[PDB]
Amino acid sequence: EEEVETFAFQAEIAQLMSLIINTFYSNKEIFLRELISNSSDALDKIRYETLTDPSKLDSGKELHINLIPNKQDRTLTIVDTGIGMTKADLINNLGTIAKSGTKAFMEALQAGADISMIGQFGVGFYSAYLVAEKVTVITKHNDDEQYAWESSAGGSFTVRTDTGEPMGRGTKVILHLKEDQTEYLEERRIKEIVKKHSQFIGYPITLFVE
Amino acid sequence: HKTFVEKYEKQIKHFGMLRRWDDSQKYLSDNVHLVCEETANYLVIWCIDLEVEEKCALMEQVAHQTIVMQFILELAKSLKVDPRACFRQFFTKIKTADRQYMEGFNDELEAFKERVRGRAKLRIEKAMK
**Domain residue ranges in chain B:** 1-129
CB A63 within 8 A of CB A46: yes
**Are the C-beta atoms of A34 and A124 separated by less than 8 Å?**
yes
* CB-facing half-sphere around the CA of B44: CA atoms within 13 A: 15
CA A156 to CA A134: how far, in whole Å? 11
**If we measure between CA atoms, which residue out of A45, A80, A76 comes closest to residue A64?**
A80
Helices (H) and strands (E) in chain A, counts: 5, 8
Q: Please report, as a single letter, which amino acid is at residue A61.
A: K
DSSP B81-93: S-GGGSSSHHHHT
* CA distances for A6 relative to A95, A144, B57, B125, angstroms: 11, 20, 28, 47
**CB-neighbour burial class of residue A162 (10 A; exposed 0-12, middle 13-18, buried 19+):** middle
Q: Is A80 annotated as a binding residue?
A: yes
Distances (CA, A) of A144 to A45, A85, A135, A147: 16, 8, 22, 9
Q: Are B66 and B43 in contact (CB under 8 A)?
A: yes
Side-chain half-sphere exposure of A161, counting CA atoms within 13 A: 5
Interface of B with A (CB under 8 A): 10, 13-14, 17-20, 22-24, 55, 57-58, 60-61, 95, 97
Q: Which domain holds residue A183?
A: 1-210
Measure Cα distances from A209 to A13, A41, A83, A168, B84 in Å: 33, 24, 25, 23, 42
Burial of B93 (0-12, 13-18, 19+ CB in 10 A): middle
Q: What is the CA radius of gyration of chain B?
A: 15
The residue type at A81: T
Q: Which amino acid is at B43?
A: L
Find the CATH number of the domain harbouring A167: 3.30.565.10
**Which of A160, A164, A159, A168 minimizes the C-alpha distance to A141?**
A168
Distance from CA of B16 to the nearest CA of A (A): 9
DSSP assignment string, B25-45:
HHHHHHTGGG-SHHHHHHHHH
Say how far apart CA A28 and CA B20 lie, in whole Å.
Answer: 19
Do residues A177 and A184 lie in contact, with contact meaning Cβ atoms separated by under 8 Å?
yes
- For residue A103, the chain B residues in CB contact (below 8 A) are 57-58
Look up residue A165 and give its DSSP letter.
P
Pick among 3.40.190.10, 1.20.58.610, 1.10.3720.10, 1.10.150.130: CATH of B1-129: 1.20.58.610
Main-chain phi, psi angles of A30, to 5 degrees: -55, -30
Question: Measured between alpha carbons, how far apart are the two ends of chain B, in Å?
Answer: 34
Q: How many other CB atoms sit within 10 Å of the CB of residue A121?
A: 26
Would you say how long chain B is, in residues?
129
Q: Helices (H), strands (E): how many in chain B? A: 6, 0
Check the annotation: does A114 bind a ligand: no
Tell me the C-alpha distance between B127 and A180, whole Å: 56
8 Å CB contact of B17 and A111: yes
Q: Do A117 and B23 touch (CB under 8 A)?
A: yes
Q: Mention every residue, 6+ apart, whose C-beta is less than 8 A from residue B18.
A: A117, A120, B24, B27, B61, B65
**A203, A40 in Cβ contact below 8 A?**
yes
Q: Which helix (H) or strand (E) holds A108?
A: helix A100-111
Maximum alpha-carbon separation in chain A = 49
Q: Do B23 and A104 touch (CB under 8 A)?
A: no
Rg (CA), chain A: 17
Cα separations in angstroms, A135 against A15, A39, A150? 17, 16, 6
- What chain B residue is nearest to A33 in terms of C-alpha separation? B23
User: By the 8 A CB rule, do A104 and B60 touch?
Assistant: yes
Judge residue A178's burial from the number of C-beta atoms within 10 Å of its C-beta, 0-12 exposed, 13-18 middle, 19 or more buried: middle
Do the chains contact at A117 and B17, CB–CB below 8 Å? yes
Q: What are the distances in angstroms from CA A167 to CA A45, A85, A131, A137, A146?
A: 18, 13, 26, 12, 8
> Is A81 exposed, middle or buried, given 0-12, 13-18 or 19+ CB atoms closer than 10 A?
buried
Those residues whose C-beta lies under 8 Å from the C-beta of residue A85, and which sit 6 or more positions away, are A93, A94, A139, A141, A171
